[PDB]
Design a protein around this ligand. Sequence first.
Ligand SMILES: CCc1c(C(=O)O)c(S(N)(=O)=O)c(CC)n1C
Ligand SMILES: CCc1c(C(=O)O)c(S(N)(=O)=O)c(CC)n1C
Ligand SMILES: [Zn+2]
Ligand SMILES: [Zn+2]
Ligand SMILES: [Zn+2]
Ligand SMILES: [Zn+2]
Ligand SMILES: [Zn+2]
Ligand SMILES: [Zn+2]
Lengths: 232, 244
Amino acid sequence: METGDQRFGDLVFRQLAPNVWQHTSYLDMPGFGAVASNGLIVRDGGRVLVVDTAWTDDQTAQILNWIKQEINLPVALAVVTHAHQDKMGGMDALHAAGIATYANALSNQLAPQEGMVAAQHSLTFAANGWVEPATAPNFGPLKVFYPGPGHTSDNITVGIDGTDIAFGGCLIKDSKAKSLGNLGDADTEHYAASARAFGAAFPKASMIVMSHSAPDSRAAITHTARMADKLR
Amino acid sequence: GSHMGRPTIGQQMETGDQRFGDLVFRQLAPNVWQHTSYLDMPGFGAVASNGLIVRDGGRVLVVDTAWTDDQTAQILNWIKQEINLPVALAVVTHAHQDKMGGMDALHAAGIATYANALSNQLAPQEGMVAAQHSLTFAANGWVEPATAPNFGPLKVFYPGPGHTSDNITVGIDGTDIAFGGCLIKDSKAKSLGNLGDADTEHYAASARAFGAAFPKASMIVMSHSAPDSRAAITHTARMADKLR
Ligand SMILES: CCc1c(C(=O)O)c(S(N)(=O)=O)c(CC)n1C
Ligand SMILES: CCc1c(C(=O)O)c(S(N)(=O)=O)c(CC)n1C
Ligand SMILES: [Zn+2]
Ligand SMILES: [Zn+2]
Ligand SMILES: [Zn+2]
Ligand SMILES: [Zn+2]
Ligand SMILES: [Zn+2]
Ligand SMILES: [Zn+2]
């Protein structure tokens, strides 16, 4: 309800930069109430790129229809940042709309176990965390980085070239957080290193976008790593 | 860095096994041998780690180091004596001491080394030397063949997270042998061994995925016990079912 925020159905959109919006969707978790999840919408000349679905097919369709209304450019592809419902719940809606989908090979391998629909294409990563470029064709400003196991074994991150923005997804929590949120599938040993690897991959990003709070500064990365140091 | 921060000899000699310094070698097939090295761990005696040696035409291929550099050098010495073909490459099956502790011995000898990209990424944290090359995997677990150059009969499969998030497995094409490494424990096991780095949620599926990937392998080779039948896979998966 913050000024400049736009509503379409159950979804809220905030412009972060001339060509970048955050999408926010909400799901009731019985016992804990409504939980926000954020992803990104990127205008890349005469096409649109999506990072992460909403919780549900219906909510993901609302994202696609808002893009049609407000941006009116075709969605070329989507990248989804791990096999949990907040990031991949809406895969069927992307596929029905004829959007090409990309995830970590590991995300696609885990998807069935995690009750998610696999992406059509698999990203693979060098030992240094950077996507093998042949697996991420025509990704325009999307720079995809695998920081290592943290929130999950499969979690990936995305920088937006020509912006100050990097997307930590569920790996990064906000700079005032008490906790690292859901650690059910987490690597408690490697998490802190993974948070720091994300920071080092995108050294000049000043706006850190994450799944479960409003955009923060780089302080979110060093706070997440400081919290993660305490897990081991 | 390493979880281990004490090399010894095995006691249970066994008839068809060959002692070579502090290591043990067993021929499993005309072109396949098991290498075994031992660490004394207080309260648990001589702890075996097993890997594989494969002869493929005029080349030898190695799966896994020994626990230590000095032990891994003795694997190379044994290969020179018993096979006398050059070691074309080694593949190591995750970033733990038993599987990657001897990387320096391979690199010293000019042997090209391969691991899961994730193993190489985790190596520094795990106190291991990274392999020279990284394997990547398709969404169905099979190695991307462009990343496994001249692997010949070594058929590398990532079964999913289990013993660790980076554990890989290796079928030996043209044989009845599949290597489960530390993912699979034998049908006599009372535990899944070290779960310090394990994925308790996905372990059972990963164990079953290994079995389904190598459906006709009748000899299952694993890190910490003698080769077993396919029962080792199902018994492991059923123990892993109790973690979730
Ligand atoms: C807000 C904390 C949170 C997370 C998280 O920390 O990322 C997830 S997730 N992506 O499923 O693990 C959930 C859904 C169960 N919740 C409630
Ligand atoms: C014999 C059980 C075992 C395992 C295992 O279960 O694989 C490992 S490992 N590869 O480091 O996790 C060790 C060394 C700590 N030990 C003693
Ligand atoms: Zn998650
Ligand atoms: Zn999340
Ligand atoms: Zn899970
Ligand atoms: Zn291990
Ligand atoms: Zn082991
Ligand atoms: Zn570890």
